[PDB]
């Protein structure tokens, strides 16, 4: 149907905007701490601690399959990155601190993304 096509065009355009959001958030992680999944070879107990691991590469795979239906879904995954790190790692660690800085800096990007998603519909 033509309606299904219009809907697919909307999803494609959301995907475009979320790709730009993802790039901007990932620039706030210049150490690349959140770039890849935590390695279960190197942190073998990880899944005993963290039930839903997340990282920027996993988000990018989902994004490119157009697997985010709305901004809320994408924000859920970004918050997992931050929240998982702040639980597994202690306050005095470079990992925790990286997460805090990512959360604070990403807030700005996400605030305007929400306006844009609502604005363009």
How far is it between the farthest Cα atoms of the chain? 56
Residues in the chain: 121
- Count of C-beta atoms within a 10 Å radius of residue 85: 24
C-alpha count within 13 angstroms, C-beta hemisphere, residue 4: 1
Counting other chains too, the contacts that 54-57 makes at CB distance below 8 Å and 24 or more residues apart are 54/80, 54/81, 54/84, 55/81, 56/22, 56/25, 56/26, 56/29, 56/81
Residue whose pair of structure tokens reads 């107990």 in the numeric block: 45
Resolution of this deposited model, Å = 1.6
54: left (phi over 0), alpha (psi -120 to 50) or beta: beta
Kindly list the domain boundaries of the chain, sorted by start residue. 1-121
Encoding tokens for residue 21? 């959001």
112 CA to centre of own chain: 16
Element (H, E) at 24: helix 2-27
Nearest to 58 by CA among 42, 41, 35: 35
Element (H, E) at 47: helix 46-49
For domain 1-121, the CATH class is mainly alpha
How many Å apart are CA 86 and CA 60, to the nearest integer?
A: 22
């Amino acid at each position: 149907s033509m309606e299904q096509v219009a809907m697919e065009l909307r999803l494609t355009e959301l995907t475009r905007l979320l790709r730009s959001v993802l790039d901007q958030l990932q620039d706030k992680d210049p150490a690349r701490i959140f770039a890849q999944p935590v390695s279960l070879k190197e942190v073998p107990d990880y899944l005993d601690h963290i039930k839903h691991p997340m990282d920027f590469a996993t988000m990018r795979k989902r994004l490119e399959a157009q697997g985010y239906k709305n901004l809320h879904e994408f924000e859920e995954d970004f918050d997992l990155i931050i929240d998982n790190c702040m639980k597994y790692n202690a306050r005095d660690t470079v990992f925790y601190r990286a997460a805090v800085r990512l959360r604070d800096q990403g807030g700005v990007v996400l605030r305007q993304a929400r306006r844009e998603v609502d604005s363009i519909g």
